[PDB]
Write a protein that binds this ligand. Structure first.
Ligand SMILES: C[C@H]1O[C@H](O[C@H]2[C@H](O)[C@@H](O)[C@@H](O[C@H]3[C@H](O)[C@@H](O)[C@@H](O[C@H]4[C@H](O)[C@@H](O)[C@@H](O[C@H]5[C@H](O)[C@@H](O)[C@@H](O[C@H]6[C@H](O)[C@@H](O)[C@@H](O[C@H]7[C@H](O)[C@@H](O)[C@@H](O)O[C@@H]7CO)O[C@@H]6CO)O[C@@H]5CO)O[C@@H]4CO)O[C@@H]3CO)O[C@@H]2CO)[C@H](O)[C@@H](O)[C@@H]1N[C@H]1C=C(CO)[C@@H](O)[C@H](O)[C@H]1O
Ligand SMILES: *[C@@H]1O[C@H](CO)[C@@H](O[C@@H]2O[C@H](CO)[C@@H](O)[C@H](O)[C@H]2NC(C)=O)[C@H](O[C@@H]2O[C@@H](C)[C@@H](O)[C@@H](O)[C@@H]2O)[C@H]1NC(C)=O
Ligand SMILES: *[C@@H]1O[C@H](CO)[C@@H](O[C@@H]2O[C@H](CO)[C@@H](O)[C@H](O)[C@H]2NC(C)=O)[C@H](O)[C@H]1NC(C)=O
Ligand code: NAG
Length: 827
């Protein structure tokens, strides 16, 4: 019947003089409790400004090192070398206070508005509000203003809303659990949240990140949020914002900037678990072409392997000679090839990969011997991606395979790690039997369920208990290295399991979703979440992975999915086929929406550049552009592509309209520029949405450079640019275009083989000026890119060279690389 804990008192505390102030304190345990294991008696507590806009609060055992995510994995600045102690800096909005109460507390508030962002003041009678710090139970709690704080993140979980619902528990423990399941912990763990405040100073946003790889539950009740973490330390970062985009800049500066993607990765991808042989995949490619549906990349799932073994080919169904011919043909036709790899290596003694893995001792061990799992080929050992020797092995196996069969990228799956068996716990081990049970799979299921046991060991005598959540991330680092060492092109990989920082290495997809209307909608919050997580190259399996799709659902899904940053149709083997050519209405919608997507390729690519620079997501919440509009905070079924393009999908069967929120102003359909929406105060509009149409609109104030439709992205890149200029009465219009060869390793780097163009448009009382400014004109000029047309929306008078109307300036024949200034007059 003992209390869960008694908390800590401040024994000493002081702010450093003679440098950028930081605060150091020693805390002492008030009293022990047997509940949840041994209390740490003395804690070192530091608060320090890493940058003016980032505060770090680090709480460690004063007398012993504890597990921390290694710097080599996630490189970051090192730690600093009644009564209250205050830490403030003249150039920082964040003010930190240490309260010497019993038990102690701390807060962080804004110097400017006095809004308290994180409030770890305990309620003295209530231990659920204390800092508790036991070897396998860390508890950290903050109160929140229930109506004003709007929280987002804490992945990975499927939810019907993007804004986090009040009164829930979010569990972070990477697990092979299908994303068609609401609420449960899924493949990745992202202990970050964004907190957008509706007042004071509407739209004032901050971020909170707990840099910890251990299993945890995070309980959010609206007026409080509480972390319950089963190991490691508290290493808490607060990002000042104050805009949502600034918070992601600050967060990704810490965890890593989003990796760039090659231009081709924005083309359409096709995959299926169950393609039977090389003839079938060839036929799929042929049928896409016959249907005039763009197809950029053909994928092969585990079917291609010899009995589900990595780095092999089925000699009957996917023989090497035919596969070489297939890939050669793809390449001749401007297409690309991506195969799957699983992490588990089959233990067959006559399998070369196993022999080599054994020779280099690359596998995760338990009880002194390689840990034996079960996955698709049966028995497997798992490479230890924390071990440099295993990463070298992985690089070498990929090289060996690529030397025999060319590939363009890699899909890494099952990397939680997934295990089809659960091993018995080591008797007496509190790692395999932890004192606090996190809510794994929604049933307090033991952490070792269907994975590698916590007592397994990694390089450096690191336990699986501590390193589990890093496995997919580490495999992603190793796989990207393997690709970079075997091709000088910008690489492409897709990973299932992720951790904070994975976006610096890989794309992600939402995993095993289902062919259900619910999942169609769930793809939107998950897409938005992964942007916040610094993983902008995100999408869901179009038409649904599990269960058989329907014509209507698949039609609505390609309509939406054609706007995902990562756009792939994929399916399980036991379902009907769902290639887009199979139903005419799906094929016809696909041609329409992939046509617009392909016209938008230069825009997606520019946004990818922006994401790598500043962390800003490609697919972003409405509140990134309209943070002062509280109505946008709870939107979960619409999203932006870049600043000013909004996608408003139909998400229900039988619907021929959708009630869609429009922020203030004028919005123009990208499918028919004569069709527009104009609102004053933002409100809902019941948009027409017939079976063959999805609503996609561009807001006043924006300029977007398009290219033409084509069946491949390479062909698209050789077409003329058409500039879409949407005027606003209240502000000049702007836009941006980034150009390189589509595949440079270091995007926008000092080598200079790239151009950045900025566009401007402004109305005068009797004229209109449209112009560009160009950085590095040379590259763009040498690539012959032509701007041949400008379309001007948003005015009620026509314009020409010396309700709403549409003006078109044609046959310009100008070089994109040559800065221009065009003066137009009204008619
Ligand atoms: C292709 C694909 O294949 C594989 O995935 C498949 C999978 O194999 C299929 O079986 C299927 O799985 C579905 C399943 O059908 C669904 O039902 C669902 O399951 C979830 C439940 O619906 C949900 O309720 C919950 O279940 C909870 C219970 O709620 C809860 O009651 C409790 O139940 C048990 C506990 O299990 C017991 O341990 C114990 O509980 C104890 C506890 O142990 C103690 O510690 C203590 O606390 O006391 C308690 C209480 O006594 O008893 C309880 C009572 O009975 O826990 C349950 C959880 O254990 O969660 C379920 C999910 O876990 O969803 C699943 C899927 O998650 O479909 C999937 C997907 O198709 C592979 O795994 C997958 O990776 C594969 N996909 C990849 C492969 C390829 C091929 O290369 C690619 O093409 C793909 O792209 C890849 O992604
Ligand atoms: C390890 O790989 C071996 C080579 O692929 C497997 O043996 C081969 O199994 C083929 C298909 O199952 C069979 O047609 C081949 O004749 C045979 N080749 C040789 C050289 O033995 C082996 O499979 C197991 O052992 C053989 C002898 C049979 O009893 C199979 O049914 C077994 O599955 C693989 N070992 C394991 C444990 O899978
Ligand atoms: C683009 O949208 C406009 C506006 O809805 C369409 O023009 C209307 O067409 C209907 C007949 O379908 C006429 O009754 C209206 O008078 C038209 N309105 C205007 C303002 O001209 C136009 O047809 C659409 N374009 C395409 C290619 O579908
Ligand atoms: C015409 O545009 C210029 C800038 O391009 C602006 O400064 C000027 O005021 C405008 N003149 C009229 C008459 O609209």
């Amino acid at each position: 019947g003992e209390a869960i804990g008694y908390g800590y008192q401040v024994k000493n505390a002081k702010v450093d003089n003679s440098t950028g102030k930081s605060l150091t304190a020693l805390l002492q345990l008030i009293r022990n409790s047997p509940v949840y294991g041994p209390d740490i008696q003395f804690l070192s507590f530091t608060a320090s400004f890493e940058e003016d806009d980032t505060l770090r609060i680090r709480i460690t055992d004063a007398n012993n090192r504890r597990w921390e995510i290694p710097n080599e994995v996630l490189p970051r600045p090192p730690p600093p070398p009644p009564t209250t102690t205050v830490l403030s800096h003249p150039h920082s909005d964040l003010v930190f206070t240490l309260f010497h109460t019993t038990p102690f507390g701390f807060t962080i508030y804004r110097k400017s508005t006095h809004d308290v962002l994180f409030d770890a003041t305990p309620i003295p009678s209530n231990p659920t509000t204390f800092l508790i710090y036991k070897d396998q139970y860390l508890q950290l709690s903050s109160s929140l203003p229930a109506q004003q704080a709007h929280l987002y993140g804490l992945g990975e979980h499927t939810k019907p809303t993007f804004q986090l619902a009040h009164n829930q528990i979010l569990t972070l423990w990477n697990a092979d659990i299908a994303s068609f399941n609401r609420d449960l912990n899924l493949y990745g763990s992202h202990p970050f949240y964004m907190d957008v405040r509706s007042s004071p100073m509407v739209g004032s946003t901050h971020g909170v990140f707990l840099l910890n790889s251990n299993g945890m539950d995070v309980e959010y009740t609206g007026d409080r949020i509480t972390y319950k973490v089963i190991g490691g330390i508290i290493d808490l970062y607060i990002f000042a914002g104050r805009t949502p985009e600034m918070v992601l800049d600050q967060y990704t500066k810490l965890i890593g900037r989003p990796a760039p993607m090659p231009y081709w990765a924005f083309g359409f991808h096709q995959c299926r678990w169950g393609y039977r042989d090389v003839n079938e995949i060839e036929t799929v490619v042929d049928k896409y072409a016959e249907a005039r549906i763009p197809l950029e990349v053909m994928w092969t799932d585990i079917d291609y392997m010899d009995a589900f073994k990595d780095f092999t080919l089925d000699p009957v169904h996917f023989p090497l000679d035919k596969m070489q011919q297939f890939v050669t043909k793809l390449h001749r036709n401007g297409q690309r090839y991506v195969p799957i790899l699983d992490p588990g290596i089959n233990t067959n003694k006559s399998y070369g990969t196993f022999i080599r893995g054994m020779q280099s001792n690359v596998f995760i061990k338990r009880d002194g011997n390689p840990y034996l799992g079960s996955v698709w080929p049966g028995p497997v050992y798992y490479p230890d991606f924390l071990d440099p020797a295993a990463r070298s092995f992985w690089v070498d196996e990929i090289k060996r395979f690529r030397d025999i069969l060319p590939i363009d990228g890699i899909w890494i799956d099952m990397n939680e790690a997934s295990n089809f068996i659960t091993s018995a716990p080591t008797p007496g081990s509190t790692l395999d039997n932890p004192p606090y049970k996190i809510n794994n799979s929604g049933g307090r299921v033991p952490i070792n369920s269907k994975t590698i046991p916590a007592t397994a060991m990694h390089y450096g005598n690191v336990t699986e208990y501590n390193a589990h959540n890093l496995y997919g991330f580490l495999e992603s680092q190793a796989t990207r290295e393997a690709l970079v060492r075997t091709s000088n092109e910008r690489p492409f990989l897709l990973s299932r399991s992720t951790f904070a920082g994975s976006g610096k290495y890989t794309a992600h997809w939402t995993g095993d979703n289902a062919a259900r209307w619910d999942d169609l909608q769930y793809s939107i919050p998950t897409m938005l979440n992964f942007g916040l997580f610094g993983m902008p190259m995100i999408g869901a399996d179009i038409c649904g992975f599990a269960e058989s799709t329907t014509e209507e659902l698949c039609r609505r899904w390609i309509q939406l999915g054609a706007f995902y940053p990562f756009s792939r149709d994929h399916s399980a083997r036991d379902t009907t086929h769902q290639e887009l050519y199979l139903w005419e209405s799906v094929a016809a919608s696909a041609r329409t929406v992939l046509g617009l997507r392909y016209q938008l390729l230069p825009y997606y690519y520019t946004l990818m550049y922006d994401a790598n620079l500043r962390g800003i997501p490609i697919a972003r919440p409405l509140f990134f552009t309209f943070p002062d509009d509280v109505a946008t905070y709870g939107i979960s079924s619409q999203f932006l592509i870049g600043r000013g393009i909004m996608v408003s999908p139909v998400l229900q069967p039988g619907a021929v309209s959708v009630n869609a929120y429009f922020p203030r102003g004028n919005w123009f359909s990208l499918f028919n520029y004569t069709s527009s929406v104009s609102v004053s105060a933002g409100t809902y509009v019941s948009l027409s949405a017939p079976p063959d149409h999805i609503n996609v609109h561009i807001h006043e104030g924006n300029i977007v450079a398009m290219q033409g439709e084509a069946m491949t992205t390479q062909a698209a890149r050789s077409t003329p640019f058409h500039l879409l200029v949407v005027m606003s009465d209240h502000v000049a219009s702007t836009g941006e275009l980034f150009l390189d060869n589509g595949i440079e390793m270091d995007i926008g780097g000092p080598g200079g083989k790239w151009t950045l163009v900025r566009f401007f448009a402004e109305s005068g009382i009797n004229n209109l000026t449209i112009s560009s400014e160009v950085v590095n004109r040379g590259y763009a000029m040498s690539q012959r890119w032509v701007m041949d047309k400008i379309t001007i929306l948003g005015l009620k008078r026509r314009v020409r060279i010396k309700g709403f109307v549409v003006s078109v300036i044609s046959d310009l024949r100008q070089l994109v690389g040559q800065a221009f200034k065009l003066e137009l007059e009204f008619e």
